[PDB]
Amino acid sequence: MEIKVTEIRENKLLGRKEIYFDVLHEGEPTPSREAVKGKLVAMLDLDPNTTVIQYIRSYFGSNVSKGYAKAYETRERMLYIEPEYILVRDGLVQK
Amino acid sequence: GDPKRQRKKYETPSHPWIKERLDRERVLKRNYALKNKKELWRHETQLKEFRRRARRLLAARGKQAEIERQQLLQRLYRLGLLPADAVLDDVLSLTVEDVLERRLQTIVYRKGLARTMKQARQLIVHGHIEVNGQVIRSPGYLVLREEEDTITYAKGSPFAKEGHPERMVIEQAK
Amino acid sequence: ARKGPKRHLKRLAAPTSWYIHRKAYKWAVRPSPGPHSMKTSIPLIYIVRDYLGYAKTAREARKILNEGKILVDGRVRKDYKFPVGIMDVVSIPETGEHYRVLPNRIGKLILHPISEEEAKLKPFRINNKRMVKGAKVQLNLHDGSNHLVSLAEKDAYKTSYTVIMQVPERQIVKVLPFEVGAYVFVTQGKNVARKGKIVEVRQFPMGWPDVVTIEDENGELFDTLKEYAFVIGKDKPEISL
RNA sequence: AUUCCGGUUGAUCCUGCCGGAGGCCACUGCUAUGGGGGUCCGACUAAGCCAUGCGAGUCAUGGGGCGCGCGCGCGCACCGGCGGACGGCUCAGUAACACGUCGGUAACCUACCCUCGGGAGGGGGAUAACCCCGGGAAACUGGGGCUAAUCCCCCAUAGGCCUGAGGUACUGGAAGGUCCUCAGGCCGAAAGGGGCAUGCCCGCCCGAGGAUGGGCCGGCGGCCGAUUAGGUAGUUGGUGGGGUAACGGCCCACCAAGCCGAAGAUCGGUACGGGCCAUGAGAGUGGGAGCCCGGAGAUGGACACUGAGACACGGGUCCAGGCCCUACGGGGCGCAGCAGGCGCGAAACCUCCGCAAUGCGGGCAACCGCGACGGGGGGACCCCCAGUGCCGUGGCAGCCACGGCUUUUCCGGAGUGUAAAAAGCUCCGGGAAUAAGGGCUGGGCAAGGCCGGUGGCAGCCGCCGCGGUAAUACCGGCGGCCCGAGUGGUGGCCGCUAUUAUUGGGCCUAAAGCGUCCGUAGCCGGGCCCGUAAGUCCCUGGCGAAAUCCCACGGCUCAACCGUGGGGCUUGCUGG
Which InterPro entries does the entry link to (chain C)? Predict the structure, then answer.
């Protein structure tokens, strides 16, 4: 599995970086959120916390999936802005 | 009033049991390995729509008529039915066999990737064929002019192997 | 049978002047009353969420607005139903961004980026004049706002002239008159967003409105309503278009 | 595809009707593998009837109390504010300014919102909660004590309305409409409240305008009947008044005799209207439940309170009609809101999950709630894409066998997806394994002169016609033809039909020229010159919502679907 960033935007009003990336997985299954986040931060020099992946989506026959993440500056703003269901879905938070 | 429901994109015949028509259509169905008459009828319908558009636009006045003439010719070019130096009367010389030539099953048989039309169909439906990089599983896709030379076996597919037995058998024909 | 006013808007019944996907959902935001008309304005949440993209959901947009980060004619606005309209200036200082609201040639509302020096001025068309108590003069302007002027300086103001003002403080500068060489921008009608120079004005009897004849850059002449002709300069646009 | 085929005779040409052959909608017989999209599922019959539970709340930044904790916080009911007049359901009534379009209000109202210009002074009162007693089967409800406010009341000042007399600043196409001065009078504000902190945020009242949402008026347009010909008596108008938010016989007093109509009044029948839909080469014919706009209704029929807004869809009073609890003294409820059951009938689904998205209300906000909405479940609703194997050899003329290949679908798993699931998508393992029917077979009309049976009985039959003992026409077997996850049957609209005829029919003998004439309205009308510009034609401005229609491009594997643009539609109206 490999990653390839495709568009970064900065939102100063909400205080985050919106990151659209591609994932390449030929002959392999759809990767897991853990691995995707690991490689994302290992590459772009981010804190694992303060970072949430919204979605990894695969298409009909491609081997090329798409993904969208959000990198925050501080965990307080992170938790005040993002809804709880994605935090529970990633694992940053227990119910 | 009433709202509109979705309508069929094919037209059935006026009389069901006419011998000349039955013979023609039997030949076509057999030779292009079609499953039903619906498919033949929907390609006939495509052609009839093109013809009606040309008939309406021919000898008409205004700006939109010119725009639509050029749009129609560009579309037929892009689909592979007319050349570029084509005039609007050349639309009225087209037949259903052209539209049947332009479908995936036929092109996959005509390039040599399969021994037969029914084999071509099975390849497509099972997922062994790629167009412009993308797997397509519909044997009536109507390939475009600038997609034809990119049609090959799918990357992950047994036939991608130069030594597959069925691929050896297939190539043995050529 | 309805027993009182509406509080809901169906998305298929929303104004044409909006960029809006009409079949995606059932409901749309119903605009509150305010500075412009429903046919010349759009709520803020659509700008913050759809036109610019700083938010994906209405909760995020509402948090942005309540934190106090969007200005309209230099004033903080926190209501998501507030209507923004023609010639309004939208400002975001945390980004340095400054836009003017204008119509397309189709008749839809767009954001034209501008500079910080021009984001301080806004023109107003005078729509009516009144005498108010104290022998004072009230000017009723195109966005429904009102401004007071004295007797002595009453003949300097008329009902299709334009007044340029510093917006948060509302100080007048550079009155522009309706004349025969004046530069005009069209706001409504079939010829919306065309510009040029006044050539002629015709009047009619018995309540029918007045018509104006205009010459564009290429020399093409056309016609519209005087109330649709918005003066923006004497021979050159005082603002960017 | 701007279409014909069968039927009246011993044979023929005609007229003319019946039938065949196509499409859409509803019920139904037999049969059925998968995914996706959509504005489908008690409208036709009963706007018929029921049980259980839900569908409308929110605010400690308005006020007092109590409790649970640690002067700070969490909760409970109460007073108070805003909302509850929207959303949702249905088409009974209505032939009408109800609807559509163009206009008008200089004859009107508008809480929430925007802008500008100005204000917040001085005094009082009560009462819910709480405490002590209770009454009643319940529904409900009495007395005494105590106490707050953005609760209620008074005084003043600003301000509002009426009238008369002047002046002439504004707008407009047009003014006593706004402005100024004077005079005589009637009505008559406000919460300087809350939070923070050492000026800011949220709120209160007056005025001028706008916006939003409505009320009222007019011109034009839209079904059938003469075996419905006269109708109207506040009826038509005038003067003067009342009432209304406002014009108005809307209502009153007085004066007159007008108003409508054979170009169809009145009466009756039927029906919610449109955007749209179905069909056809078109001209045209027919419909108007599901999505949007408008209108009306909440067991039938009337009448009111509160409020900016109701004569009120989850509120009130009465009569009729029905149902229920009851200790028999008295009380309570209408399922045309969601789900569920009954009945009626040919005929219509789960007493499911959630506020994560779109929006609404409240709140400074944070957030709360929502049977709206979203999500799934059931159903031969409409549309798109596919499957039920492929290759080669031998034998026949599609099948058996032999040898191989593949896995869309099937089974079993891991991730992604999702509010949570599920489905879908990526990958893995196994394995040709798991998946065709219905109607027809004499001619119209594609397909058997083959077998067994029965025997003018039994049966078939859109129409023509078969069957009476050699049945190509009945029943069945075997073969074959059409369509195909669908194919047949019954009823309705269009077309067929130039059998309603403007395009485009006929009347000597086939259905059809009044027995003949005179003439009223209407329709049709000779030649030249002058003028006008109502009809007619061209050009330009303002309108005819969105959806739905055609075309291209772009995003879902293509497609259906969705988006961005260009045209068309709204049968037309209006300024030049």
Answer: Rib_uL2_dom2, Ribosomal_eS4, Ribosomal_eS4_central_region, Ribosomal_eS4_central_sf, Ribosomal_eS4_KOW, Ribosomal_eS4_N, Ribosomal_eS4_N_CS, S4_RNA-bd
